[PDB]
Design a protein around this ligand. Structure first.
Ligand SMILES: Nc1nc2c(ncn2[C@@H]2O[C@H](COP(=O)(O)OP(=O)(O)OP(=O)(O)O)[C@@H](O)[C@H]2O)c(=O)[nH]1
Ligand SMILES: Nc1ncnc2c1ncn2[C@@H]1O[C@H](COP(=O)(O)OP(=O)(O)OP(=O)(O)O)[C@@H](O)[C@H]1O
Ligand SMILES: Nc1ncnc2c1ncn2[C@@H]1O[C@H](COP(=O)(O)OP(=O)(O)OP(=O)(O)O)[C@@H](O)[C@H]1O
Ligand SMILES: C[S@@+](CC[C@H](N)C(=O)[O-])C[C@H]1O[C@@H](n2cnc3c(N)ncnc32)[C@H](O)[C@@H]1O
Ligand SMILES: C[S@@+](CC[C@H](N)C(=O)[O-])C[C@H]1O[C@@H](n2cnc3c(N)ncnc32)[C@H](O)[C@@H]1O
Ligand SMILES: [Mg+2]
Ligand SMILES: [Mg+2]
Lengths: 1057, 49, 76, 76
């Protein structure tokens, strides 16, 4: 598709009306209409009005009388706001009525009326010789042949040319015109040549490659800057046109070479003409910034003036030394020849040269316009690096980047009110177990739990996490934008938690509109409010699970036993206004009214009872463990005695403490208390504090004691740290292949030229990196990129430093972002619970692996996209056996990583386990490679097969992850599981198919029958803290509730030989 | 006074750039005829909106 | 949990803009917006108006010419 | 006195947040001012201010008339 197909035409001639049409050309009878007769726009930002007449009127000189019309006075009358369409239409209409162009209507169909000379003569009020010639003989304006229209008047006047002023396009500006267009009497090509050659000896003149009305016309500039801005706009036009032509589309090019040909100009114009005629690749790639076009054009010229390509440089130089010559590619020239063959006497510019376009392979990425780029850096590339120098990142203002401490949660309102259960497992509590658990509980309470865990608990507050969601409900209710919801709905409870004023539905599912002028104050919530609310919802769901309404039943009561102001009692009182007779009271030692101020145990005289109790008692004072123990025992006892459904808090949920609770409940006469541990989503994500749930039932409870409960493990496994908590640093100096970085994030700015290099260097650490420039003019490019431990574990396996730097240099300068808006990164980004559990399991397995001695290799079967790479040490060889893994032989060879790329056979004969090897089977055992779930008996079968297969080799360690059965019992009873599910009895993590679960006892019994050594470990609190500290991940609430029961029920079998 | 503040914040004078864009001083200074032969122009007469 | 964990930083320095950002620091093209560019509140009880510029502008000395602007005449 | 008061309040809130063990972006570790030359009353503010007295965490002081309360605290 080489040859251009374009239909050339003199568009400016086609615009000139037939003489018969001039009388009604203003359409005197009817109002001018927008979008047809005019275009008005008010740019409120620049506060500039802009009118633009359409049709023949787009070229209209205005007489000073026309300027005196009120229409042109309008923008002054409305300095700040748009001219109303009424006034604009009426003024433009009456002014339009005022205009009248001298003309003689005729019968011959061949005539056209010379609109230019007509309106021009009118504007000068018929004073100039053309104006006189016209007012005396209007019939002179009619023309058959377009050129003779002017020859008639040059002959009539005897003048060699007419200097005709240009109209401004907007009719509101009255600015003095940058140039004017002279029109020469040059009937033949020879006259055109002589005039051009004379013009090439006179200041500030230029011209088009061809002329409308087939009559020569030159532009004459008042100043050099005007010549520059004109040349710029024309170059842009010819580049857009040539771009459209090269795509091969048919196009109505009014003239084949749109750009101007300087005849006499300053140097800078000659540079514009030169790069302009190059049709440089940079325009198609949008490498230039068009907002400041001529500047960019001047800049482009300079590079072409000293271009690395000899061809382009000699070509540009040549064009610069012969500026008067028009340069064109051959594909243009054929269009010129076609245009000549159609109309033999057409005039076009005599002095021309046909250069061959020089190909250039540099395919720049680019995109002007808003949007930061979110890079995904490759581990490796074609480029080799040798000892790249450290790259400092600049200081950045808060106007560009800010770093908030924690990412606020995004979540549906219902998800906040969920909770998880953990039922008792042990059938008995033997005394030796009591002494052991007491020793662990006392040793643990005596020295406070991990300082890092307490840091995350004290930074990831639930109040701040839920504030952006809660206030959003306030702002919507405040506008009246909120509407339908059920009476008992959780969205209703959130609405109660947003605003201090009582709300009331006008009828079913319709909240009352606010009284006029009223803007109720948002409800005041302390950190524990929403948690108390979710405990209320929890007690409601526990009383019966099917319910959707959460209103209290009529004639019932609830007590929020720990209290200060306790906003929750007020919100709840407000929630139940439509329900008759519902006692609701806080009852703390620090209680303010409405709540009664009272100590627990209750004074013997005082009578207290309720259908529900929600204790949140917690001693602020430091105290002995025996005192805290007796206090919590008296608290749970008094809470259980006083209600049919207690929901006690436990600040120190050791196994010994909870078992002491169940034993003490056992000691009370005549009531068998069913019980369960619990954790709501509105708790602070990291708090180990756990809500025990007591309730009488007629039967004695089988398996009443706890052991290895998840909620308890969350607390007990945390212990005083051997290291200070890892504070997230903000790095600036990017060393080339260093591996000295503490977890945190790179953040800063570089020159746009250095930017491809800097991205290529930080791919060593960061797995991805957002970048952007603030504006087209500012040359600094901001970059943010958090450090991925997994990418460090990948890139530092060998000393080679490959990167896609060649690809990154396609970005400079427009290809890597723009964003005027301030951006706000968080030190702790959100991540889904499955991903977090995966990282915790990786921390557990990695710390476990570093202890192991003398093993040649790690083999992660089912490794996907090297997901387990964080686990393996930089030394020992890594292997993957996921069929779905993509191959990268350069990356594999460079990074010491074999990839089997075939399904792994679990059958013992097929098995080929090496000596001195660590076999990871993380989460792969539960699925077939095609993604369909494998039945649990088949899972147990393949585990048994891996066991017997590794039974023979002397040194090996398998890690078979799987899902324990008990979790399905718990999620059947829980609520807060936006991710995890229980479809038809199978776990359904993420988007994965539901998959049947193993029971831990049968698996352990099988491994004991095999005779192999094993140890069913699961990751604990310190592992969680390591994953969060390293990856820069805050937990989030729903994940905070679900994570313990989820983590406990993904056991990791650790076969060892 | 308001429009004047807004105007003179842009600059009391300007100079044409080699690219032909205007570049206003940003400074409020009284003009002298010594500037007539200089690169500088009075900013009142720029006719830039 | 004894030892303090705090990230020290010269916040007042971080507020100072890059020189390239000063030209558009007033955001000349667009209207200042509440809650981002300013905070206005009218305390009907004390009947006192209170404007408060955000960003770099939170530290702005005013010239006596700036005080002559109608904006500052508004509370009256 | 009023400056010393506001700064003492700031350092007490900050130290309270630090003692809870939360990570915090303290722009400077000791927020309160150090008189170099002042009247007696300022020296009292500096003194109880540096005590980080339990009374602030307990909200025993009335913050509406801060310096007064601070002077009072100093006396005890
Ligand atoms: N006063 C006046 N000027 C005209 C009229 N028609 C065309 N021109 C001017 O003639 C100049 C060159 O005409 P053309 O070659 O047809 O168009 P152009 O050079 O691409 O310029 P524009 O089409 O206006 O962007 C333009 O700058 C127009 O402003 C007219 O009827 N009256
Ligand atoms: N982009 C260009 N195109 C053609 N000729 C150029 C270009 N740049 C410079 N020259 C020639 O080389 C000389 C270089 O001058 P110099 O670079 O010192 O200042 P200049 O002319 O303003 O160019 P620049 O804008 O690159 O500084 C000029 O006299 C000019 O004739
Ligand atoms: N809170 C205080 N802190 C330090 N020094 C004090 C304090 N109160 C009193 N003093 C010292 O003891 C003296 C007691 O003075 P006196 O109590 O009569 O009046 P005062 O200085 O205004 O104190 P007050 O406000 O308690 O009346 C003072 O000179 C002062 O130096
Ligand atoms: C951690 S606070 C939470 C209270 C409630 N969730 C709130 O803030 O609205 C627990 C409160 O229980 C109170 N408390 C402690 N021991 C108590 C006891 N033995 N009897 C009654 N209240 C007690 C304390 O004063 C403390 O303020
Ligand atoms: C459930 S996915 C994710 C596993 C785990 N999260 C990880 O990244 O290590 C397990 C992967 O193992 C692969 N796989 C499934 N069955 C396999 C088998 N029998 N042998 C080897 N790989 C298998 C699949 O391609 C799948 O992508
Ligand atoms: Mg045109
Ligand atoms: Mg400060």
């Amino acid at each position: 598709m080489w040859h251009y197909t374009s239909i050339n035409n003199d568009t400016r001639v086609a615009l000139d009306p037939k003489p018969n049409q001039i009388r009604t050309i203003t359409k005197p009878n009817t109002v001018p209409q927008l979008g047809t007769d005019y275009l008005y726009t008010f740019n409120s930002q620049r506060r500039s009005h802009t009118l633009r007449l359409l049709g023949p009127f787009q070229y209209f000189n205005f007489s000073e009388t026309d300027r005196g019309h009120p229409l042109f006075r309008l923008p002054l009358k409305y300095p700040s706001k748009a001219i109303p369409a009424d006034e604009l239409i009426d003024n433009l209409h009456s002014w339009m009525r005022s205009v009248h162009l001298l003309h003689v209507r005729s019968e011959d169909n061949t005539l056209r009326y010379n609109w230019m000379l007509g309106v021009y003569a009118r504007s000068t009020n018929y004073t100039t010789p053309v104006g006189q010639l016209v007012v005396n003989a209007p019939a002179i304006l009619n023309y058959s042949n377009p050129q003779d229209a002017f020859n008639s008047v040059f002959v009539a006047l005897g003048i060699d040319y007419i200097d005709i002023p240009i109209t401004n396009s907007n009719i509101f500006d009255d600015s003095s015109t940058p140039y004017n267009v002279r029109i020469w009497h040059a009937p033949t090509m020879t006259e055109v040549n002589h005039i051009l050659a004379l013009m090439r000896k006179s200041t500030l003149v230029s011209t088009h490659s061809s002329w409308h009305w087939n009559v020569l016309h030159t532009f004459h500039y008042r100043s050099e800057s005007d010549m520059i801005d004109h040349f710029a706009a024309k170059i842009l036009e010819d580049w857009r046109q040539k771009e459209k032509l090269d795509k091969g589309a048919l196009v109505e090019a009014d003239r084949v070479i749109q750009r101007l040909i300087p005849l006499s100009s300053s140097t800078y114009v000659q540079r514009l003409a030169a790069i302009g005629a190059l049709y440089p690749n940079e325009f198609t790639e949008n490498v230039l910034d068009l907002s400041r076009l001529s500047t960019a054009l001047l800049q482009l010229s300079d590079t072409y003036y000293q271009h690395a390509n000899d061809q382009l440089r000699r070509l540009y130089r040549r064009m610069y030394n012969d500026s008067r010559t028009l340069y064109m590619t051959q594909r243009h020239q054929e269009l010129l020849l076609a245009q000549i063959t159609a109309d033999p006497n057409i005039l076009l510019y005599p002095y021309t040269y046909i250069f061959t376009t020089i190909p250039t392979s540099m395919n720049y990425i680019s995109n002007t316009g808003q949007g930061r780029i979110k890079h995904s850096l490759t581990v490796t590339g074609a480029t080799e690096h040798d000892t790249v120098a450290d790259i400092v990142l600049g200081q950045t203002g808060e106007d560009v980047i800010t770093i908030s401490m924690v990412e606020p949660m995004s979540i549906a309102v219902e998800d906040m009110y969920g909770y998880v259960l953990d039922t008792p497992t042990r059938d008995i509590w033997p005394a030796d177990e009591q002494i052991e658990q007491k020793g662990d509980a006392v040793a643990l309470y005596d020295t406070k739990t991990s300082r890092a865990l307490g840091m995350f608990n004290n930074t990831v507050r639930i109040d701040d996490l839920l504030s952006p969601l809660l206030s959003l409900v306030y702002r919507t209710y405040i506008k009246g934008d909120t509407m339908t919801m059920t009476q008992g709905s959780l969205d209703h409870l959130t609405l109660c938690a947003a605003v201090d004023s009582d709300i009331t539905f006008v009828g079913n599912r319709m909240i009352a509109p606010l009284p006029e002028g009223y803007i109720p104050k948002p409800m005041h919530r302390n950190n524990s409010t929403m948690k108390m609310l979710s405990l209320y919802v929890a007690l409601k769901k526990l009383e019966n699970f099917a319910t959707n309404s959460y209103l209290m039943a009529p004639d019932t009561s609830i007590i929020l036993l720990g209290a200060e102001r306790e906003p929750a009692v007020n919100i709840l009182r407000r929630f139940n206004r439509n329900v008759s007779n519902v006692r609701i009271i806080g009852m703390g030692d620090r209680a303010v009214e409405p709540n009664i101020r009272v100590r627990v145990p209750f004074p013997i005289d005082k009578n207290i009872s309720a259908d529900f109790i929600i204790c949140d008692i917690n001693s602020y004072e430091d105290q002995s463990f025996e005192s805290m123990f007796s206090e919590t025992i008296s608290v749970v006892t008094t809470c259980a005695s006083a209600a049919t459904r207690a929901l006690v808090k436990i600040n120190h949920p050791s196994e010994y403490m909870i078992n002491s609770v169940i034993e003490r409940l056992s000691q009370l006469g005549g009531v068998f208390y069913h019980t369960a541990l619990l954790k709501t989503a509105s708790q602070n994500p990291y708090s180990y504090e756990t809500y025990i749930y007591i309730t009488p039932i007629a039967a004695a409870v089988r398996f009443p004691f706890y052991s290895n409960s998840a909620m308890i493990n969350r607390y007990m496994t945390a212990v005083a740290d051997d290291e200070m908590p890892i504070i997230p640093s903000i790095h600036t100096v990017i060393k080339g292949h260093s591996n000295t970085y503490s977890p945190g994030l790179f953040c800063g700015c570089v020159d746009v030229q250095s930017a491809p290099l800097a991205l290529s260097q930080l791919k060593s650490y960061c797995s991805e990196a957002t970048t952007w420039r603030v504006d087209s003019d500012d040359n600094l490019v901001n970059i943010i990129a958090r450090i991925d431990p997994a990418r460090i574990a990948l890139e530092f396996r060998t000393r080679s430093n490959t990167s896609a730097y060649h690809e990154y240099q396609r970005y400079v300068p427009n290809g890597l972002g723009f964003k005027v808006r301030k951006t706000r990164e968080f030190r702790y980004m959100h991540r889904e619970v499955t991903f977090i559990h995966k990282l915790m399991m990786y921390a557990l397995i990695r710390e476990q692996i570093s202890l192991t001695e003398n093993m040649t290799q790690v083999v992660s079967i089912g490794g996907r996209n090297l997901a387990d790479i964080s686990v393996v040490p930089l030394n020992m060889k890594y292997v993957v056996i996921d069929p779905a893994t993509r191959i990268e032989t350069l990356t594999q060879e460079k990074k010491n990583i074999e990839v089997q790329s075939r399904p792994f056979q679990f059958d013992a004969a097929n098995m080929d386990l090496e000596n001195n090897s660590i076999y990871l089977f993380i989460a792969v055992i539960m699925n077939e490679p095609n993604g369909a779930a494998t039945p649990a008996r088949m899972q147990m079968d393949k585990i048994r097969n891996v066991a017997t297969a590794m039974l023979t080799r002397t040194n090996c360690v398998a890690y078979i992850s799987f899902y324990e059965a008990g979790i399905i019992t718990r999620l059947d009873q829980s609520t807060a599981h936006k991710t995890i599910r229980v479809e038809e009895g199978r776990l359904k993590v993420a988007n994965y198919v539901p998959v049947d679960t193993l029971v831990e006892a049968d698996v352990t019994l099988m491994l004991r029958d095999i005779g192999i050594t094993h140890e069913i470990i699961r990751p604990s609190t310190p592992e969680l803290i390591d994953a969060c500290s390293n990856y820069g991940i805050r937990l989030g609430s729903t994940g905070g509730a679900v994570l313990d029961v989820f983590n406990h029920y993904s056991p990791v079998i650790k076969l060892v030989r | 006074p308001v429009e004047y503040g807004i105007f003179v914040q842009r600059g009391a004078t300007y100079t044409i750039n080699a690219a032909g864009e205007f570049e206003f001083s940003g400074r409020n200074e009284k003009w002298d005829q010594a500037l007539y032969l200089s690169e500088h122009f009075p900013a009142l007469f720029s006719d830039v909106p």
